[PDB]
Design a protein around this ligand. Structure first.
Ligand SMILES: [Zn+2]
Lengths: 105, 99, 319, 131, 63, 148
C-alpha cells in the first residue's frame, strides 16, 4: 500500500530519510545506546517528478489529533473546550499583547 | 526528569562525538543548486549562515557565542525554552499549544 | 461630562470604557470601542480629551460633550501600542509600539514636522517621560533600558540583567529615583540624573528589592515621591517607602480558598493628589479603591462584564 | 495610459479628450454635426473623472471582483452626480458595451446609472433644426 | 430601481462617516533640521525646584 | 587550534602514523580529513593560488579512497567527502588520474548509497568532470540496473 502525492516536492523528503538512516547506524554501534534500543522509524519515499511523489504507507499508525478526538467524543467532551474557554474570557485573543496572552492561556 | 532527560543526554553526546558524519550529509543538502531555492526566501550567502548555525548547535555555542556549554547544561536550557509559557502562547491556534 | 475636579475611567475586553466617580459608585457614562481591546489609557494635561490606544489605532474620545464615538483617531502603525503620553504643555504625543518603534506624534494640524522615530531591536513594553520633559525611557523585551534624550539623537543602553523582559518604568515627579520591574519580580532602582544643567544622564544602581515572586506587571511612583506601588501576578500589591525601601503596606485580593486558583491578576494602580488613596484595577471584572494605612478597601466598581486591564485617575493639582 | 498610472496613486492624489475611442462616426451627438447641422458641444477637473469612470467599466468586464468595482462606481455618482450628464460619455460606454461581454446583472447596473438624465444638448439642437 | 435604492442607501452612512477625524502617519520629519531640533522638540524645561506641601484637599470633598 | 603554523605540524605527525601501522582506519581517515580541512582554510584566506591547493588536494583524494576500501559498510562520510572535491576541484588535470584509479580500485557496491547526489549534478557544464560521472553510472547499470 502506498500514498500517491500530488502538488508536493518530495526531493527534500528523500534527503532527510538518508540523514535518518545515518543516525540509525550511529546509534547502532554505540554500546550505551544499542542496549537501550534507540532508533528512528522511516518510510519509503520515491519521488517521480518535481511536483509528484510516492510515499510508503505505514500500517497500524494513527495521527495524534484523531487519537485524542475519539477519546473526547466518547466521554461526551467537546473537542475544543480549552479553546472555547479562552475565547469566552477574551474574544480578541489574537490581538492581545504578550503579557495579556499569558494570562488567558 | 526520568527517561526523557536521560535519553536526551545520551543522544546529544553521540551527535557531538560524530559531528563530521552529520555535517557531511547536511553540506551536500544545503549546497545543492536545484534544491536550496526553497530555502532562499551573493546567492550562496544565506547557505553559509545556515551551516554555521547547525555547527553551533552541535558544539554548544548556540545560546551564547561567547562560551561553550556542556551537554547537561544545553539540554536544560532547551527544556526550559520548549515548555515556557511565554513561548507557547505565541504559537498559532491550529498548532494547539494548549494540547 | 469631564467637568469635575476628579475623574476616573476603566477599560478592558468589554469593548466599552466606563466613566465613574469616586463619590458614588454610579457610572456616569459608557463610551463605545469596537474591534479592539484597550491596553492603556491616559488623559490630556488640559483635562478636556482622553486617549485610549489598542491594536494599531489610538482612538481619542470627547469629555465635555456626550459623544460615544472616537471623534479623533490615529493610524499608520502596524502593531499594538504599549503606552501613550503627552508633554506637560500638550505639544506632542509620544507612543510606544510593539513594532520595535517608539515615536512622537505632533498635535498641531500644520506642517511643523516635529516627529522623530526611535528604532530598537526588540518590541517595547513601557515608555516613561522625565519630569523635565527633556528625556524619555524605552524598555524592551530584552531587559535593555534605553534612555533617549531629545536634545541629541543618541541614547545610552543600560541592561541590569538579560533574558528577562521588563514590563514598566516610571520616574517620580520630584526627580528623586527611577524604578523598573521585570518578568521575575525584581524591582531595580537607579539614582537618576544629577546633572540638571546639561543633562549628563548618569545612573548608578542603588538597590534591589526582592519581592513579587510571580510576574511583575506595573510600577508607579506617587506625586509626593514618598511611595512606590508595584503590581504583581500573585494578586497582591506591595507599597514601598523611599526612606529605607521597606514594606509600608501590603494589599491583596486572595480569597484564601484553593478552589479559585488565581481567579485574576492585578494589573494597574494609581495614586491621588495627597498620596493617600489609591485606585487599583484587577482582572476580576472590577476595580477597587484602597487606603494606604487601614488596608481595607473603601469602594468597589462593578459595571464591567469582562476583565479590566487599564485605568486613568487624575484629580486637581492641589491636594 | 490612465489604466497603468492609476494603480500607483489615488483619486484624490491626482486632483491635488479623455474619451479614447470617440471618433465622429460612432457618437449619438457628434454624428449630427454634418448631416443635420448641429452645434458643437460645450464644456481639467472633468477630464480626470471620465478616465476613472471608463477604466472601471473595463475592470467590470472580467467579473473577477465585481463588488469592488460596483462600489467604486457608486461613489462617483454621489460625490460628482453631474459627470453622468454628457451624451459623449454615454456613446463611449454604449460602444464599449457592444464589443465586450458583460454579465446580465452587471449589464443592468450600467445603462441604468444613466436613467435620470436630461441630456439638454440634443433637445436644444433638435428643436432648432426641425423648426 | 435596484441601484437607485443602493445609491440612496449608501448616502445614509456617508452622513455618519464624516464625524471622525483621521490623521495618518506620513514618513516625513525634520531630517535636515539637525540644528533646529535644539528647540523644536527640545524645550528642556528644567525647573520646579521648589517643593510645595499639600493639605489633602483633593479627597477632602470626595469623602 | 587550527593555525597557519599548526597545520603543517600535524600533517607530519599524521603522515608518520600512517606508515608505521597501515590498514588502520583511524590513521587514513584522519589524515585525509586534515588535508581536506587545510584546503578549505586556504580557499577562505585567498578570497578575503592554483598551485597552492595542488599539493593538498591530491593527497586528500588518495587518503579517502584508501579509507573507503578499509571500512566497507560504514563509509557514508568518506564516500561523500570524495564527491565534494570531485565536483569542485576535479577540473584540474592532476585530479583526474587520482580519481580514475580510485573509482576502479574500490568495489562498485559502494556508490549505491550516494546515487541521489550523483543524479543531482549530471548537468555539470564542465566536460572534463562531466563524462567521468557517466561511465560509472553506466557501470552501475551493468551490475545493478534496477536501482538506478
Ligand atoms: Zn461625441
Amino acid at each position: 500500500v502506498f500514498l500517491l502525492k500530488g502538488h508536493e516536492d518530495l526531493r527534500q523528503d528523500e534527503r532527510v530519510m538518508q540523514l535518518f538512516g545515518l543516525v540509525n547506524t550511529l546509534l547502532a554501534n554505540d554500546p550505551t545506546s544499542l542496549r537501550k534500543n534507540l532508533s528512528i522509524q522511516r518510510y519509503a519515499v520515491i519521488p517521480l517528478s518535481t511536483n509528484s511523489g510516492l510515499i510508503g504507507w505505514v500500517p497500524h499508525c494513527d495521527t495524534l489529533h484523531a487519537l485524542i478526538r475519539d477519546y473526547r467524543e466518547k466521554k461526551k467532551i467537546l473537542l475544543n473546550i480549552e479553546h472555547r474557554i479562552m475565547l469566552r474570557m477574551a474574544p480578541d485573543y489574537d490581538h492581545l499583547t504578550l503579557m495579556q496572552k499569558v494570562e488567558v492561556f | 526528569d526520568g527517561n526523557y532527560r536521560i535519553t536526551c543526554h545520551t543522544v546529544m553526546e553521540v551527535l557531538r562525538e560524530h559531528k563530521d558524519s552529520v555535517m557531511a550529509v547536511l553540506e551536500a543538502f544545503v549546497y545543492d543548486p536545484l534544491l536550496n531555492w526553497r530555502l532562499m526566501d551573493a546567492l550562496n550567502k544565506k547557505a553559509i549562515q545556515i551551516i554555521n548555525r547547525v555547527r553551533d548547535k552541535l558544539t554548544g555555542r548556540d545560546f551564547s557565542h561567547d562560551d561553550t556549554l556542556d551537554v547537561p547544561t544545553q539540554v536544560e536550557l532547551l527544556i526550559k525554552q520548549a515548555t515556557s509559557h511565554e513561548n507557547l502562547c505565541q504559537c498559532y491556534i491550529g498548532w494547539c499549544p494548549f494540547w | 461630562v469631564g467637568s469635575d475636579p476628579v475623574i476616573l475611567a476603566t477599560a478592558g475586553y468589554d469593548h466599552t470604557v466606563r466613566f465613574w466617580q469616586a463619590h458614588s459608585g454610579i457610572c456616569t457614562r459608557t463610551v463605545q470601542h469596537q474591534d479592539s481591546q484597550v491596553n492603556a489609557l491616559e488623559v490630556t494635561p488640559d483635562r478636556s480629551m482622553i486617549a485610549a490606544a489598542g491594536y494599531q489605532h489610538i482612538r481619542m474620545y470627547d469629555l465635555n460633550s456626550n459623544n460615544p464615538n472616537p471623534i479623533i483617531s490615529y493610524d499608520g502603525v502596524n502593531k499594538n501600542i504599549a503606552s501613550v503620553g503627552f508633554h506637560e504643555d500638550g505639544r506632542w504625543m509620544y507612543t510606544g509600539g510593539e513594532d520595535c518603534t517608539a515615536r512622537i506624534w505632533d498635535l498641531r494640524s500644520r506642517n511643523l514636522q516635529c516627529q522623530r522615530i526611535f528604532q530598537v531591536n526588540a518590541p517595547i513594553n513601557c515608555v516613561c517621560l522625565h519630569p523635565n520633559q527633556a528625556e524619555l525611557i524605552v524598555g524592551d523585551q530584552s531587559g535593555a533600558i534605553h534612555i533617549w534624550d531629545l536634545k541629541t539623537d543618541h541614547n545610552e543602553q543600560l541592561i541590569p540583567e538579560p533574558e528577562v523582559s521588563i514590563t514598566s518604568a516610571h520616574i517620580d515627579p520630584d526627580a528623586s529615583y527611577m524604578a523598573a520591574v521585570n518578568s521575575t519580580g525584581n524591582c531595580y532602582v537607579w539614582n537618576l540624573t544629577g546633572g540638571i544643567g546639561d543633562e549628563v544622564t548618569q545612573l548608578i544602581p542603588k538597590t534591589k528589592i526582592p519581592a513579587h515572586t510571580r510576574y511583575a506587571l506595573q510600577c508607579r511612583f506617587s506625586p509626593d515621591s514618598t511611595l512606590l506601588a508595584t503590581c504583581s501576578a500573585d494578586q497582591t500589591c506591595k507599597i514601598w517607602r523611599t526612606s529605607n525601601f521597606s514594606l509600608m503596606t501590603e494589599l491583596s485580593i486572595k480569597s484564601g480558598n484553593p478552589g479559585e486558583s488565581s481567579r485574576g491578576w492585578m494589573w494597574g494602580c494609581a495614586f491621588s493628589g495627597d498620596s493617600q488613596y489609591i485606585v487599583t484595577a484587577s482582572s476580576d471584572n472590577l476595580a477597587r479603591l484602597w487606603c494606604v494605612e487601614t488596608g481595607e478597601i473603601k469602594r468597589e466598581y462593578g459595571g464591567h462584564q469582562k476583565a479590566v486591564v487599564c485605568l486613568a485617575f487624575n484629580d486637581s493639582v492641589l491636594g | 495610459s490612465f489604466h497603468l498610472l492609476r494603480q500607483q496613486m489615488s483619486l484624490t492624489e491626482i486632483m491635488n479628450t479623455g474619451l479614447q475611442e470617440h471618433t465622429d462616426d460612432n457618437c449619438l451627438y457628434c454624428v449630427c454635426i454634418e448631416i443635420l447641422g448641429f452645434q458643437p458641444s460645450n464644456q481639467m477637473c472633468r477630464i480626470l473623472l471620465r478616465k476613472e469612470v471608463l477604466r472601471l467599466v473595463i475592470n467590470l468586464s472580467s467579473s473577477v471582483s465585481t463588488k469592488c468595482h460596483e462600489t467604486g462606481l457608486l461613489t462617483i455618482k454621489e460625490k460628482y452626480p453631474q459627470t453622468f450628464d454628457d451624451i459623449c460619455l454615454y456613446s463611449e460606454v454604449s460602444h464599449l458595451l457592444s464589443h465586450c461581454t458583460f454579465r446580465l446583472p452587471c449589464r443592468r447596473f450600467i445603462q441604468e446609472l444613466f436613467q435620470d438624465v436630461q441630456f439638454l444638448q440634443m433637445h436644444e439642437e433638435a428643436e432648432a433644426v426641425l423648426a | 430601481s435596484n441601484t437607485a435604492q443602493r445609491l440612496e442607501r449608501l448616502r445614509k452612512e456617508r452622513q455618519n462617516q464624516i464625524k471622525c477625524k483621521n490623521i495618518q502617519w506620513k514618513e516625513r520629519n525634520s531630517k535636515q533640521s539637525a540644528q533646529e531640533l535644539k528647540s523644536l522638540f527640545e524645550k528642556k524645561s528644567l525647573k520646579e525646584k521648589p517643593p510645595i506641601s499639600g493639605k489633602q484637599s483633593i479627597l477632602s470633598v470626595r469623602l | 587550534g587550527i593555525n597557519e603554523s599548526t597545520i603543517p605540524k600535524v600533517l607530519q605527525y599524521y603522515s608518520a602514523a600512517t606508515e608505521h601501522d597501515r590498514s588502520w582506519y583511524k590513521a587514513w581517515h584522519a589524515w585525509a580529513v586534515m588535508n581536506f580541512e587545510a584546503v578549505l582554510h586556504y580557499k577562505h584566506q585567498n578570497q578575503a593560488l592554483s598551485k597552492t591547493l595542488l599539493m593538498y588536494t591530491v593527497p586528500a583524494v588518495q587518503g579517502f579512497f584508501r579509507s573507503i576500501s578499509l571500512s566497507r559498510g560504514n563509509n557514508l562520510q568518506d564516500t561523500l567527502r570524495v564527491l565534494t572535491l570531485w565536483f569542485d576541484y576535479g577540473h584540474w588535470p592532476d585530479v583526474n588520474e587520482a580519481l580514475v584509479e580510485g573509482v576502479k580500485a574500490i568495489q562498485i557496491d559502494t556508490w549505491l548509497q550516494v546515487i541521489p547526489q550523483l543524479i543531482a549534478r549530471i548537468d555539470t557544464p564542465r566536460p572534463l568532470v562531466g563524462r567521468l560521472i557517466h561511465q560509472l553510472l553506466t557501470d552501475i547499470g551493468r551490475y545493478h540496473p534496477q536501482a538506478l
